[model samples]
Target: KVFGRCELAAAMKRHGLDNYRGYSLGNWVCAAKFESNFNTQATNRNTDGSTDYGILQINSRWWCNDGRTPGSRNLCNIPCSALLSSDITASVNCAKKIVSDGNGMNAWVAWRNRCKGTDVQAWIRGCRL
Candidate 1:
């Protein structure tokens, strides 16, 4: 797992995502926190028969192909396993692409449910940005 929120922030900064595509760093931090808790290997099966993959909990229905799912858009062009790596570069890049494509953070259920309209700064609390 990553060191913590600070480390995640640092890595994000290095990735040129402190404030990416009009989304705040806190947005990314909060989404990642609720989605996977900084655990790269996180996965979940949604009631819709789709799986959420990686730290961002990207979906198999429209994002990556987890193999078991057929006819996935695979827009990220990377397998779901790539999202589960300890090296978060692939996942971060995919998420950025997703947000840039117009879905924004609204694409993530956890972000919309737990982070929307909330004080998201708390997700990055005590982090050195």
Candidate 2:
């Protein structure tokens, strides 16, 4: 799971028309690529039953709602449209925030390389740009 490859990349490429632009797309993709591999249905529920779900891994326990499902269950929940939307502005922006939170872009860079192909980390470790 340390790899950056996930369904979210293709999803982001497919969407992200109006809200995000240029490297903004790359930044979101890069951040999430390392953080969670961009799993839409992905979720993390704590011992207290609080949860974090969807692409950006929005925490339902504290940030979202009580519903079992995402959008309907909780408005706080990252909307499904954000994940699968024809445009991923909101979703991508959320990912950017994650990077902004001091998560570091290199992690994404490493994970993306690690998961995408063989010896990706090898290539990244010795890479320049």
Candidate 3:
């Protein structure tokens, strides 16, 4: 499912992303906008044989197992398919894990290139949090 900007912001807030690890909700919202445009079923194949899955684009090489990424650690202990689900519970949980792993939001290149040091507050502006 593709979510509206505020809709996705609200959802991320519900999952405790508002101030997760000192990163604002806007950061998450901005990352999703660039990473997947709020689409739950997005996927991108990397040049290293790994694939990124879901709205946050969790990677198969270190996070989820796609059964295709070589030397996958599957640290999230979930199938890559699970990230594509519209429920988003698993995706959000896995994202939290990624943050808690010390990677911070920089785990996603999209966040670095598009969101970092920017006025991400605009991503969730006018959203009733």
Cα RMSD for candidates in order:
1.4, 8.4, 0.8
lDDT (Cα, 0-100) at 97 in candidate 2: 49
Best-matching candidate per TM-score: 3
Candidates' C-alpha lDDT: 0.84, 0.44, 0.92
The pairs that clash in candidate 1 are none
The residue ranges of model 1 lying beyond 4 angstroms of the native Cα positions read none
Task: Give the candidate order by descending TM-score.
Answer: 3, 1, 2
lDDT of model 3, residue 104: 92
Clashing pairs in 2: 15-86, 16-87, 16-88
Q: How many residue pairs clash in each candidate?
A: 0, 3, 0
lDDT of 3 by residue, 33-98 (tens): 899999999999999999999999999999998989877799989999999998888899999999
All candidates: TM-score: 0.91, 0.40, 0.97
Estimate, for each residue in 1-129, the C-alpha lDDT of model 2 and write its tens digit.
Answer: 222343344455556521342233344444454545554545565556655545555545334453554343333345434443324455555544444454433324443454333432332232222
- Candidate 1 vs candidate 3: which has greater TM-score? 3
Model 3, TM vs. native? 0.97
lDDT value for candidate 1? 0.84
